[PDB]
């Protein structure tokens, strides 16, 4: 009651079960109240990695670098380690498969000056694009906490970012991850591997009939083996909190 | 090859559930249709709640609905469907098929503009004869499964004459089911006021590299079988390997 952030260390049981470490942050939009298993880690800023595809998508769409969610981004012919990257993509499949090369091309066309202005307008993380214009979210200066992800996501949900309503609608479509008669999840995965420590991200929100629960989680990810725990652990927390059955 | 093919093997899914109806599929990439029954595929019925798709579009385009957040206050009349007896926005009104909300939309739209819009949409028989607030339940309007797919394909491609925004919002409102394999945007219907009593499910399956449009209706003598609209459609999508 009235508390801004409440710590619930019982969620650590979900991390410990999988011999892992991290944070889940929830925000109840109706009550304007946050919950986390770790207040400190909740506010620790990391590389966004592929969670950066949300603001990158928005900026690309607003500037006309991406025409719409149907525009085809031709594979450059370089065979990369992730099979799904080695084919043509539109914004939907690029987001779904986390296709870095497509987004690196977006970033180059956006350019450092306009990328910087946009991240300042978005109040995104530390607003620092230092490093390579086409890799800064992977190994440059930009850093964002789970609680800063939620602030940015809430603005996207309410179409309050200083880009077009259309841009915001298309990205929220592109974020669609799961839906049934109980809930809808719009979300984006990330895996930061270029700079220690290696972490997994899942950020987004749960739409219910009468409420929205924003979430941002990150966890230590020494190998790709555990990538599935990003979603599995978040769902164990959403279930415990009765947000999803 | 052929624009339309009959696949009578799907009748086994209707037989299995002691039911009678049609499933119509359209492969958008191949521009080819498939159905278990070409005759029934082209029989026109009352749209009932499948009309909530064009109604939503017209309401949004004319500013009768501001956005998918605008709250439509319950009028205080207790109706038979529990979920109708509460406040709604466009998302929840579509999800729970809340007729009274849509009846109010229709009254604000009015006969003249509703008629012009259905003509522009080439929607079914374009006939709004009866009450402006109930014509899709017991008035003149009729649409076949094959005509549902024509209309849906225009909505998918933002080719209806209404604003792109209108089309985007309704497609959001249609969202039914999503996972790593597919997305379903769809609308249920149950026509009971004129025989024959039928269940509808119309919409599409979005895959990575294709869209499958679908329109199914089936005889629905009682509400007991409403679950078969989705179950029978899914038996067909799985047989055709469209969803795992
Ligand atoms: Br829009
Ligand atoms: Br990822
Ligand atoms: Br008016
Ligand atoms: Br959507
Ligand atoms: Br219905």
In whole angstroms, what is the distance from residue B169 CA to residue B160 CA?
13
Rounded distance between C-alpha atoms, residue A9 and residue B5, angstroms: 59
Q: Which CATH class is domain B4-239?
A: alpha beta
Distance from CA of A180 to the nearest CA of B (A): 5
Q: Which of A50, A57, A145, A192 is catalytic?
A: A50
Distance from CA of A236 to the nearest CA of B (A): 18
| DSSP letter assigned to residue A138 | H
CB A45 within 8 A of CB A125: yes
Position of tokens 């003598």? B221
Distance CA A65, CA B77 (A): 51
Between the CA of B47 and the centroid of ligand 5 the distance, in Å, is 10
Largest CA distance in chain B: 55
Residues in B closer than 8 angstroms to A179, CB to CB, are: 175-178, 183
Q: What is the resolution of this structure in A?
A: 1.8
Rounded distance between C-alpha atoms, residue B76 and residue B74, angstroms? 5
Q: Which of A169, A176, A210 sits opposite B183 (nearest CB)?
A: A176
A181 dihedral zone (left: phi>0; alpha: psi -120 to 50; beta): alpha
Q: How far apart are CA B50 and CA B176, in angstroms?
A: 14
- What is each CA distance from B17 to A71, A108, A163, B45, B236, in whole angstroms? 42, 56, 51, 22, 13
Cα distance between residue B102 and residue B136, in whole Å: 11
% helix, strand, coil for chain B, step of 5? 40, 20, 40
CB B147 within 8 A of CB B49: no
Check: CB of residue B136 under 8 Å from CB of residue B47. Answer: yes
The correct answer on CATH 3.30.70.360 for the domain covering A5-240 is: no
Q: Give every CB contact of residue A190 below 8 A, 6+ residues apart in sequence.
A: A48, A49, A50, A51, A52, A98, A199, A200, A201, A202, A203
Domain edges within chain B:
4-239
Alpha-carbon separation of residue A64 from A164, A166, A197 (angstroms): 11, 12, 35
Query: Which residue in chain A is spatially nearest to B208 when comparing CA positions?
Result: A93
Torsion sign, CA atoms A34, A54, A61, A119:
positive
Please report where in the chains the tokens 């109840």 appear, as a residue: A28
Burial code of B115-150, b = ≥16 C-beta within 10 A, e = fewer? Answer: bebbeebebbebebeeebbebbbebebbbbbbbbbb
Whether B42 and B144 have beta carbons less than 8 Å apart is answered as yes
Comparing CA positions, the residue from A47, A80, A55 lying closest to residue A194 is A47
Determine which helix (DSSP H) or strand (DSSP E) holds B198, and give its type and residue range: strand B198-206
List CB contacts (< 8 A) between B208 and chain A. Answer: 93, 96
Structure method: X-ray
Cα(B85)–Cα(B63) distance, integer angstroms: 25
CA distance B158 to B61: 13
Q: How far apart are CA A95 and CA A53, in angstroms?
A: 7
* CA-based nearest distance A68→chain B, Å: 11
DSSP string, A204-224: EEEE-SS-EEEEEEEEE-SSG
């Amino acid at each position: 009651q009235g508390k801004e952030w409440q710590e619930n260390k019982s969620w650590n049981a979900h991390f410990t079960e999988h011999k892992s470490q991290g944070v889940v942050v929830l925000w109840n939009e109706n009550k304007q109240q946050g919950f986390t298993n770790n207040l400190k880690r909740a506010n620790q800023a990391f590389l966004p990695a592929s969670t950066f595809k949300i603001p990158n998508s928005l900026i690309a769409l607003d500037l006309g670098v991406v025409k719409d969610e149907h525009q085809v981004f031709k594979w450059d012919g370089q065979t990369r380690d992730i099979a799904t990257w080695n084919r043509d993509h539109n914004l939907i499949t690029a987001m779904k498969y986390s296709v870095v090369p497509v987004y690196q091309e977006f970033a180059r066309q956006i350019g450092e000056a306009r990328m910087s202005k946009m991240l300042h307008a978005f109040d995104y993380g530390n607003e620092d694009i230092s490093g390579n214009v086409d890799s800064f979210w992977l190994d440059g200066g930009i850093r964002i906490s789970a609680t800063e992800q939620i602030s940015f996501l809430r603005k996207l949900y309410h179409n309050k970012l200083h880009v077009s309503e259309r841009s915001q609608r298309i990205v929220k479509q592109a974020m669609l991850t799961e839906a049934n008669g109980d809930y809808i999840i719009r979300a984006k995965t990330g895996y930061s591997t270029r700079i220690e420590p290696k972490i997994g991200w899942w950020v987004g929100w749960v739409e219910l009939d009468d409420n929205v629960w924003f979430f941002a989680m990150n966890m230590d990810m020494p190998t790709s083996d555990g990538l599935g725990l990003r979603q599995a652990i978040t769902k164990e927390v959403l279930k415990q909190e009765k947000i999803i059955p």
